[PDB]
Design an enzyme around this catalytic site. Structure first.
Site, PDB file in Angstrom:
ATOM      1  N   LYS A  34       7.696   1.617 -15.817  1.00  0.00           N
ATOM      2  CA  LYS A  34       9.083   1.436 -15.364  1.00  0.00           C
ATOM      3  C   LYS A  34       9.154   0.740 -14.003  1.00  0.00           C
ATOM      4  N   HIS A  75      14.004  -0.158  14.951  1.00  0.00           N
ATOM      5  CA  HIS A  75      14.819  -1.360  14.812  1.00  0.00           C
ATOM      6  C   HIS A  75      13.934  -2.585  14.637  1.00  0.00           C
ATOM      7  N   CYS A  87       4.544   9.842 -17.593  1.00  0.00           N
ATOM      8  CA  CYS A  87       4.689   8.976 -16.419  1.00  0.00           C
ATOM      9  C   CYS A  87       3.721   7.790 -16.460  1.00  0.00           C
ATOM     10  N   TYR A 107      19.285   7.919 -15.829  1.00  0.00           N
ATOM     11  CA  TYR A 107      18.488   6.968 -15.057  1.00  0.00           C
ATOM     12  C   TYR A 107      17.579   6.136 -15.965  1.00  0.00           C
ATOM     13  N   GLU A 134      17.262   3.285  10.011  1.00  0.00           N
ATOM     14  CA  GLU A 134      17.715   3.713  11.332  1.00  0.00           C
ATOM     15  C   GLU A 134      19.205   4.031  11.337  1.00  0.00           C
ATOM     16  N   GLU A 189      17.982   2.304 -15.460  1.00  0.00           N
ATOM     17  CA  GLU A 189      16.826   1.579 -14.930  1.00  0.00           C
ATOM     18  C   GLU A 189      16.364   0.494 -15.896  1.00  0.00           C
ATOM     19  N   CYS A 201       7.136   6.506 -15.278  1.00  0.00           N
ATOM     20  CA  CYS A 201       7.289   5.977 -13.915  1.00  0.00           C
ATOM     21  C   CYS A 201       6.482   4.705 -13.679  1.00  0.00           C
TER      22      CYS A 201
HETATM   23  C1  LIG Z   1       9.777 -11.276  20.903  1.00  0.00           C
HETATM   24  C2  LIG Z   1      10.334  -9.885  21.076  1.00  0.00           C
HETATM   25  C3  LIG Z   1      10.491  -9.052  19.965  1.00  0.00           C
HETATM   26  C4  LIG Z   1      11.004  -7.757  20.102  1.00  0.00           C
HETATM   27  N1  LIG Z   1      11.128  -6.967  18.966  1.00  0.00           N
HETATM   28  C5  LIG Z   1      11.614  -5.754  19.107  1.00  0.00           C
HETATM   29  C6  LIG Z   1      11.770  -4.934  17.913  1.00  0.00           C
HETATM   30  O1  LIG Z   1      11.482  -5.268  16.763  1.00  0.00           O
HETATM   31  N2  LIG Z   1      12.296  -3.666  18.159  1.00  0.00           N
HETATM   32  C7  LIG Z   1      12.667  -3.159  19.403  1.00  0.00           C
HETATM   33  O2  LIG Z   1      13.111  -2.003  19.463  1.00  0.00           O
HETATM   34  N3  LIG Z   1      12.519  -3.941  20.518  1.00  0.00           N
HETATM   35  C8  LIG Z   1      12.025  -5.183  20.363  1.00  0.00           C
HETATM   36  N4  LIG Z   1      11.872  -5.975  21.484  1.00  0.00           N
HETATM   37  C9  LIG Z   1      12.283  -5.423  22.788  1.00  0.00           C
HETATM   38  C10 LIG Z   1      13.800  -5.373  22.954  1.00  0.00           C
HETATM   39  O3  LIG Z   1      14.320  -6.689  22.771  1.00  0.00           O
HETATM   40  C11 LIG Z   1      14.150  -4.865  24.358  1.00  0.00           C
HETATM   41  O4  LIG Z   1      13.559  -3.585  24.568  1.00  0.00           O
HETATM   42  C12 LIG Z   1      15.659  -4.784  24.630  1.00  0.00           C
HETATM   43  O5  LIG Z   1      16.258  -6.068  24.442  1.00  0.00           O
HETATM   44  C13 LIG Z   1      15.987  -4.254  26.012  1.00  0.00           C
HETATM   45  O6  LIG Z   1      17.415  -4.316  26.212  1.00  0.00           O
HETATM   46  P1  LIG Z   1      18.041  -4.344  27.667  1.00  0.00           P
HETATM   47  O7  LIG Z   1      19.539  -4.066  27.503  1.00  0.00           O
HETATM   48  O8  LIG Z   1      17.254  -3.418  28.524  1.00  0.00           O
HETATM   49  O9  LIG Z   1      17.819  -5.844  28.164  1.00  0.00           O
HETATM   50  P2  LIG Z   1      18.146  -7.226  27.456  1.00  0.00           P
HETATM   51  O10 LIG Z   1      18.414  -7.008  26.006  1.00  0.00           O
HETATM   52  O11 LIG Z   1      17.027  -8.250  27.818  1.00  0.00           O
HETATM   53  O12 LIG Z   1      19.517  -7.672  28.178  1.00  0.00           O
HETATM   54  C14 LIG Z   1      19.546  -8.056  29.568  1.00  0.00           C
HETATM   55  C15 LIG Z   1      20.582  -9.140  29.690  1.00  0.00           C
HETATM   56  O13 LIG Z   1      21.016  -9.266  31.068  1.00  0.00           O
HETATM   57  C16 LIG Z   1      20.943 -10.628  31.443  1.00  0.00           C
HETATM   58  N5  LIG Z   1      20.767 -10.725  32.887  1.00  0.00           N
HETATM   59  C17 LIG Z   1      19.594 -10.675  33.598  1.00  0.00           C
HETATM   60  N6  LIG Z   1      19.748 -10.802  34.897  1.00  0.00           N
HETATM   61  C18 LIG Z   1      21.120 -10.955  35.049  1.00  0.00           C
HETATM   62  C19 LIG Z   1      21.937 -11.135  36.185  1.00  0.00           C
HETATM   63  N7  LIG Z   1      21.468 -11.192  37.437  1.00  0.00           N
HETATM   64  N8  LIG Z   1      23.274 -11.248  35.986  1.00  0.00           N
HETATM   65  C20 LIG Z   1      23.747 -11.189  34.736  1.00  0.00           C
HETATM   66  N9  LIG Z   1      23.075 -11.021  33.592  1.00  0.00           N
HETATM   67  C21 LIG Z   1      21.759 -10.910  33.818  1.00  0.00           C
HETATM   68  C22 LIG Z   1      19.804 -11.200  30.610  1.00  0.00           C
HETATM   69  O14 LIG Z   1      19.858 -12.621  30.566  1.00  0.00           O
HETATM   70  C23 LIG Z   1      20.112 -10.532  29.266  1.00  0.00           C
HETATM   71  O15 LIG Z   1      21.181 -11.186  28.592  1.00  0.00           O
HETATM   72  C24 LIG Z   1      11.368  -7.294  21.378  1.00  0.00           C
HETATM   73  C25 LIG Z   1      11.212  -8.124  22.487  1.00  0.00           C
HETATM   74  C26 LIG Z   1      10.700  -9.415  22.350  1.00  0.00           C
HETATM   75  C27 LIG Z   1      10.539 -10.298  23.563  1.00  0.00           C
HETATM   76  C1  LIG Z   2      11.186   6.304 -18.773  1.00  0.00           C
HETATM   77  C2  LIG Z   2      10.817   7.426 -17.838  1.00  0.00           C
HETATM   78  C3  LIG Z   2      10.690   7.176 -16.472  1.00  0.00           C
HETATM   79  C4  LIG Z   2      10.344   8.200 -15.583  1.00  0.00           C
HETATM   80  N1  LIG Z   2      10.244   7.900 -14.234  1.00  0.00           N
HETATM   81  C5  LIG Z   2       9.923   8.847 -13.417  1.00  0.00           C
HETATM   82  C6  LIG Z   2       9.793   8.510 -12.006  1.00  0.00           C
HETATM   83  O1  LIG Z   2       9.975   7.392 -11.517  1.00  0.00           O
HETATM   84  N2  LIG Z   2       9.440   9.593 -11.196  1.00  0.00           N
HETATM   85  C7  LIG Z   2       9.207  10.903 -11.638  1.00  0.00           C
HETATM   86  O2  LIG Z   2       8.895  11.778 -10.811  1.00  0.00           O
HETATM   87  N3  LIG Z   2       9.325  11.189 -12.975  1.00  0.00           N
HETATM   88  C8  LIG Z   2       9.660  10.210 -13.806  1.00  0.00           C
HETATM   89  N4  LIG Z   2       9.761  10.503 -15.149  1.00  0.00           N
HETATM   90  C9  LIG Z   2       9.514  11.898 -15.586  1.00  0.00           C
HETATM   91  C10 LIG Z   2       8.032  12.222 -15.733  1.00  0.00           C
HETATM   92  O3  LIG Z   2       7.486  11.390 -16.753  1.00  0.00           O
HETATM   93  C11 LIG Z   2       7.854  13.689 -16.146  1.00  0.00           C
HETATM   94  O4  LIG Z   2       8.613  14.558 -15.308  1.00  0.00           O
HETATM   95  C12 LIG Z   2       6.393  14.156 -16.134  1.00  0.00           C
HETATM   96  O5  LIG Z   2       5.583  13.234 -16.862  1.00  0.00           O
HETATM   97  C13 LIG Z   2       6.198  15.554 -16.684  1.00  0.00           C
HETATM   98  O6  LIG Z   2       4.785  15.835 -16.785  1.00  0.00           O
HETATM   99  P1  LIG Z   2       4.239  16.925 -17.793  1.00  0.00           P
HETATM  100  O7  LIG Z   2       2.758  17.207 -17.510  1.00  0.00           O
HETATM  101  O8  LIG Z   2       5.092  18.149 -17.736  1.00  0.00           O
HETATM  102  O9  LIG Z   2       4.386  16.222 -19.231  1.00  0.00           O
HETATM  103  P2  LIG Z   2       3.733  14.902 -19.835  1.00  0.00           P
HETATM  104  O10 LIG Z   2       3.444  13.916 -18.745  1.00  0.00           O
HETATM  105  O11 LIG Z   2       4.684  14.406 -20.947  1.00  0.00           O
HETATM  106  O12 LIG Z   2       2.372  15.383 -20.531  1.00  0.00           O
HETATM  107  C14 LIG Z   2       2.386  16.181 -21.731  1.00  0.00           C
HETATM  108  C15 LIG Z   2       1.288  15.640 -22.595  1.00  0.00           C
HETATM  109  O13 LIG Z   2       0.923  16.612 -23.605  1.00  0.00           O
HETATM  110  C16 LIG Z   2       0.886  15.964 -24.862  1.00  0.00           C
HETATM  111  N5  LIG Z   2       1.107  16.951 -25.914  1.00  0.00           N
HETATM  112  C17 LIG Z   2       2.293  17.327 -26.490  1.00  0.00           C
HETATM  113  N6  LIG Z   2       2.169  18.251 -27.417  1.00  0.00           N
HETATM  114  C18 LIG Z   2       0.804  18.498 -27.455  1.00  0.00           C
HETATM  115  C19 LIG Z   2       0.015  19.380 -28.224  1.00  0.00           C
HETATM  116  N7  LIG Z   2       0.511  20.212 -29.145  1.00  0.00           N
HETATM  117  N8  LIG Z   2      -1.324  19.383 -28.005  1.00  0.00           N
HETATM  118  C20 LIG Z   2      -1.825  18.557 -27.080  1.00  0.00           C
HETATM  119  N9  LIG Z   2      -1.181  17.687 -26.295  1.00  0.00           N
HETATM  120  C21 LIG Z   2       0.138  17.707 -26.531  1.00  0.00           C
HETATM  121  C22 LIG Z   2       1.930  14.860 -24.763  1.00  0.00           C
HETATM  122  O14 LIG Z   2       1.760  13.872 -25.774  1.00  0.00           O
HETATM  123  C23 LIG Z   2       1.636  14.355 -23.345  1.00  0.00           C
HETATM  124  O15 LIG Z   2       0.514  13.480 -23.301  1.00  0.00           O
HETATM  125  C24 LIG Z   2      10.113   9.494 -16.080  1.00  0.00           C
HETATM  126  C25 LIG Z   2      10.238   9.741 -17.446  1.00  0.00           C
HETATM  127  C26 LIG Z   2      10.588   8.722 -18.331  1.00  0.00           C
HETATM  128  C27 LIG Z   2      10.713   9.013 -19.810  1.00  0.00           C
END
Ligand SMILES: Cc1cc2nc3c(=O)[nH]c(=O)nc-3n(C[C@H](O)[C@H](O)[C@H](O)COP(=O)(O)OP(=O)(O)OC[C@H]3O[C@@H](n4cnc5c(N)ncnc54)[C@H](O)[C@@H]3O)c2cc1C
Ligand SMILES: Cc1cc2nc3c(=O)[nH]c(=O)nc-3n(C[C@H](O)[C@H](O)[C@H](O)COP(=O)(O)OP(=O)(O)OC[C@H]3O[C@@H](n4cnc5c(N)ncnc54)[C@H](O)[C@@H]3O)c2cc1C
Ligand SMILES: CN1CCC[C@@H](OC(=O)c2ccco2)C1
Ligand SMILES: CN1CCC[C@@H](OC(=O)c2ccco2)C1
Lengths: 588, 588
Positions: free
Chosen positions: A157, A566, A149, A291, A571, A295, A154
């Site tokens: 890679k 969100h 690895c 893989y 999600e 990859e 890994c």
């Molecule tokens: C900058 C910012 C970033 C945010 N980022 C996230 C985020 O990443 N993740 C997350 O989960 N939440 C986020 N939020 C919060 C999320 O937007 C609110 O929790 C969500 O929109 C609430 O939904 P609601 O249906 O309760 O009200 P709203 O989505 O505000 O809908 C209410 C609607 O009713 C309308 N309305 C109001 N009064 C009247 C009326 N008298 N007559 C008719 N229509 C009316 C409004 O104009 C509006 O269109 C963020 C908020 C802000 C301000």
């Molecule tokens: C290209 C590639 C990508 C991979 N990507 C991933 C990944 O993203 N995620 C993941 O979980 N796994 C990945 N793997 C698998 C991962 O490499 C192995 O599952 C893991 O390394 C196994 O560990 P090990 O200790 O059993 O063997 P090794 O890590 O191979 O260690 C054994 C060691 O013992 C040595 N050895 C051998 N014979 C002797 C001896 N007689 N005396 C002394 N030393 C000796 C070897 O040379 C080596 O250094 C990948 C493998 C490859 C080939």
């Protein structure tokens, strides 16, 4: 029940103190052990519910029923007065180093699992040696400590995948207002390799530092298990010697396979060679469809290469095949060519590699399609990604007694024990377990705890999540859809699914209905979630959290009652409602 | 038990069929309703537990015990033969359309929750009207259908956050091998705003099409509730009229506040104006320190703005203050300037907005620090993010009887019912509930189902996950650390934490120990995970999946026994082991 645990714990632990947090006599021993830099395990009886039967059962070993009690390698050493007597008499050091063996533990293999196991056992006072050797590849490529690895898997890679992803970021930047022009920007392969290898080197160095700081002996030598307690080592000068250890952990990993066709070994390369190649591969043929193959093809194409994949039968054999095809379709619509139902017959060399001017060679590839039609084309590089295999014949004398399965992997009980009572195996050579780096690390840490600290927890290998880091990524946890139907019947399986569009793709004018996710559920088990699947950006970050809920037995209703974050891609899993049986479209 | 459900369902549903999947007499009736293009709910009695007791209880309305039975607005209509008698004589249309009121449902407010509730209600046969009007801002800004998230909130905010993130992608690309020069690239504000607004306008139109294709009447007018069943509307010519509905859902959201100081309304803007501003704001002052304030300050600086934030007391009041301080430390180190413990006193105009050549004006800001020291500086734009509030005196006649709280929010029961029995509230104006778009959507959909399809599921408002989309994002689920300590006592709380570095940041030469995560756990309840917190890239996608495991009661052991996906940032949650009580460093 409890007696068999105490016996197993006392016999394999190297230094272990039985103690109580309430008793001050235990603290006097603890303090003495700290001062003398004596690492040990400790078991506080006033924290285990059956700790009053454990205090009683201790007398079978020490003829006393009180705490503290200190053991060394299965032999009772004494109570408070006896340890202190050894301290002020300058006798305690030689006591705690009494061993029939050179090491309490010998680890063969310095990779993901081996390094984790060795570090953890040393924390409990086990004298530990870790062996690692890297057999060079056919063109001679070699690398440093840390395993597959870290050096050729890994880590490099995903770095190169990230360099590929950045091409779209430059594209997207214009639509969001930035002034650059993507068409005038090019990629420098060797600049990126230098940066990747620099980070890998800091990982090599970090691992050697951690083994020194833990008092682990690191031997850069090839190991061979010649008898249950004897390991034969050969070093950089081909000098041969023998060391002994109580417990042996095999963890040697796999290496890439080559097909048995002419020119393959002489003129192709593998992934082992790719991540440090001094020249850009140029026009490349990737043979295979794992893989690894997809990859690698994927990021070579985003970096400006002319790339073709040769597919014998299917993409991503073993994964959900509907997901596999979408993974493939996306690549094919974004600059990766595919030669489908095709296999190679020979590689012929037209140009030797220009080692001086830093250019690839030139090869002629010949093969055939499954209908007999012929394949003939020229490429600068040929990468084989046709699977991986261990070679335990180079690690294991056959007379030692360690049973192997049909593929050459070690057959283990669910506590990693082989057919030889003191020898264990972990990571990729452990037969039947997922071949993943997080799995190897967990398996090795938990085993160290069981061997040298009385722990009982096992590694749980079921429902381990994956991510395929293709240009569009694919994360999964649990059963594929076809596997679930095979196991329970189409009538007991319900599938909720939907397309989606990342908000980041709107202003950048990207595809409306390419990203996709689905949940495969079991009707009769309360609509239990048997498998989760998602194709999209950051698919590993999306998937990981859900693996905890699947471990806990989550149902469609648990998803339904959780509220989304969100705006995110992830999600979408919290409001899925369209079933496949309904026949309703999943587009948005 | 059962009877009281059936009485409420029949009395409330608009068109409801009590059916069975087995009895083909029901399929006879369903087809008639499909071809007659009549929408309705359906309660299949063979697919419910006490479905055989409901059948016997249905005779209290119809005096028959057999199935199918169809009701319209409480009244029993007939069995198979009687309904086919009405279809043949063409009497069915007037029987299903006869209502005591104009509509079965009037939704006041066409935003996240209002549009959700309305579309869901019309599925089950409810005759539905959705009212929406957008009161212009002090300088005249206005927008289309969809509410705050769609037009002036989450959607345009994250898009501009993404344009800001793309600047680091341009920086990173060099280190990964790409040949651009970030120093020579600049941003065009108005090109970005055109892209953002074009997407927004595609969502306005989409919502209008969705209402038409669901047979929902959309009125672009101001709605005032004058009696429990009467709504007075005023259109764009100030034409007043009155319509009537059975059930009423209030969902009118909030608007930004201004502080009571000279010049604020005259010369400042809010987030309502920021997302369609036709000129770049230039040197900007953001007054406030909520997520709105920090998110906007963050993307303005990334786009190359000269940005200052004026904080009265603390950053991100209500959130975990350790995480908040880390959020703000990152911003202060990457080019946002902060004026701490400081409030404004007056905004003076030095230059009027050059509406001709598309340039901002120039303002002088005077204020004072908390010790007594004075503040005085010139800015081209001043943005106020000092909270949002509902204005229900516009919407609600006090004689109707809808009880508000001290903040002006609606006091509701756990099924959203107001103190007037047929009037409900959802979304931001529902008192005490989290003010989030996914919460408003779920509340509105679940309520529609209870009113018109006989459902019982309530909306669960506990442990809803959030994400703050600052330059370095901050995702959270559950309690803050200080709130868990306060609720349970410092001795019952254990906190596991660690720093991390994304693999993508290694080759880019970004900070080692800035990203951070922690799990806040309760000892006495099995190490239950009370709250999760992560600061890092893609924090929304990291956190989402874990919200499900937390809803299910996840413990620290559930995390440990789940295996990581490698390489990802999220996998660090699966191996946490450093406790705060231990005092060991969390660096990597
Ligand atoms: C900058 C910012 C970033 C945010 N980022 C996230 C985020 O990443 N993740 C997350 O989960 N939440 C986020 N939020 C919060 C999320 O937007 C609110 O929790 C969500 O929109 C609430 O939904 P609601 O249906 O309760 O009200 P709203 O989505 O505000 O809908 C209410 C609607 O009713 C309308 N309305 C109001 N009064 C009247 C009326 N008298 N007559 C008719 N229509 C009316 C409004 O104009 C509006 O269109 C963020 C908020 C802000 C301000
Ligand atoms: C290209 C590639 C990508 C991979 N990507 C991933 C990944 O993203 N995620 C993941 O979980 N796994 C990945 N793997 C698998 C991962 O490499 C192995 O599952 C893991 O390394 C196994 O560990 P090990 O200790 O059993 O063997 P090794 O890590 O191979 O260690 C054994 C060691 O013992 C040595 N050895 C051998 N014979 C002797 C001896 N007689 N005396 C002394 N030393 C000796 C070897 O040379 C080596 O250094 C990948 C493998 C490859 C080939
Ligand atoms: C079932 N199919 C038949 C064709 C060969 C293989 O599909 C591909 O190789 C493929 C799909 C997209 C890009 O490549 C499996
Ligand atoms: C506890 N502290 C006191 C100073 C004012 C406020 O902190 C900030 O305003 C801040 C920190 C990083 C960037 O801004 C809360």
């Amino acid at each position: 029940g409890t007696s068999q645990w105490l016996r197993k714990t006392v016999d394999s632990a190297a230094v272990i103190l039985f103690s109580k947090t309430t008793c001050p006599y235990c603290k006097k021993v603890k303090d003495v052990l700290a001062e003398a830099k004596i690492k040990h395990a400790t078991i506080e009886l006033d924290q285990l519910s059956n700790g009053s039967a454990i205090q009683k059962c201790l007398a079978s070993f020490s003829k006393i029923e009180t705490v503290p009690q200190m053991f060394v390698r299965g032999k009772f050493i004494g109570d408070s007065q006896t340890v202190l007597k050894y301290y002020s008499n300058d006798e305690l050091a030689g006591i705690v180093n009494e061993s029939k063996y050179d090491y309490d533990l010998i680890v063969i293999g310095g990779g993901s699992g081996g390094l984790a196991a060795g570090k953890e056992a040393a924390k409990y006072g086990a004298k530990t040696a870790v062996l690692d050797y890297v057999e060079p590849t056919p063109i001679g490529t070699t690398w440093g400590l840390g395993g597959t690895c870290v050096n050729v898997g890994c880590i490099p890679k995903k770095l190169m995948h990230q360099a590929g992803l950045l091409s779209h970021a430059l594209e997207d930047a214009e639509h969001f207002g930035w002034s650059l022009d993507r068409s005038k920007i090019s990629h420098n392969w060797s600049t990126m390799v230098e940066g990747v290898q620099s980070h890998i080197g800091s990982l090599n160095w970090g691992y050697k530092v951690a083994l020194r700081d833990n008092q682990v002996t690191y031997l850069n030598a090839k190991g061979r298990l010649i008898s249950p307690h004897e390991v034969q080592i050969t070093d950089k000068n081909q000098k041969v010697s023998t060391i002994t250890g109580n417990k042996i952990i095999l963890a040697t990993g796999e290496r890439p396979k080559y097909p048995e066709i002419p020119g393959a070994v002489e003129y192709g390369i593998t992934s082992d060679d790719l991540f440090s190649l001094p020249y850009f591969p140029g026009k490349t043929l990737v043979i295979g469809a794992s893989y690894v193959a997809l990859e690698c093809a994927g990021f070579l194409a985003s970096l400006g290469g002319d790339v073709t994949v040769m597919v014998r039968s299917i993409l991503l054999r073993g994964f959900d095949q509907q997901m596999a095809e979408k993974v493939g379709d996306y690549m094919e619509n974004h600059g990766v060519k595919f030669a489908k139902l095709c296999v190679p017959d020979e590689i012929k060399q037209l140009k030797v590699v220009d080692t001086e001017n830093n250019k690839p060679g030139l090869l002629l590839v010949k093969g055939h399609y499954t209908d007999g039609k012929k394949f003939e084309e020229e490429f600068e590089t040929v990468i084989f990604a046709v699977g991986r295999e261990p070679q335990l014949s180079k690690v294991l004398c056959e007379t030692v007694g360690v049973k192997l399965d049909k593929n050459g992997r070690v057959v283990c009980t669910d506590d990693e024990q082989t057919t030889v009572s003191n020898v264990y195996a972990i990571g990729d050579i452990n037969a039947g377990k997922p071949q993943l780096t997080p799995v190897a690390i967990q398996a090795g840490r938990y085993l160290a705890r069981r061997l040298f600290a009385g722990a009982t927890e096992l590694t749980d290998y079921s429902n381990v999540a994956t991510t395929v880091f293709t240009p569009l990524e694919y994360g999964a946890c649990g059963l594929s859809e076809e596997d679930a139907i095979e196991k329970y019947g189409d009538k007991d399986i319900e599938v909720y699914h939907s397309n989606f569009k990342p908000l980041e793709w709107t202003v950048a004018h990207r595809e409306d209905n390419v990203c996709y996710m689905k949940l495969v559920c079991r009707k009769s088990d309360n609509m239990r979630v048997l498998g989760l699947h998602v194709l999209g950006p950051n698919a590993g970050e999306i998937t990981q959290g859900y693996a905890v809920a699947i471990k806990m037995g989550a149902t469609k209703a648990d998803f339904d009652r959780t509220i989304g974050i969100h705006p995110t891609c992830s999600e979408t899993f919290t409001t899925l409602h369209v079933t496949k049986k309904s026949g309703v479209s999943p587009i948005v």
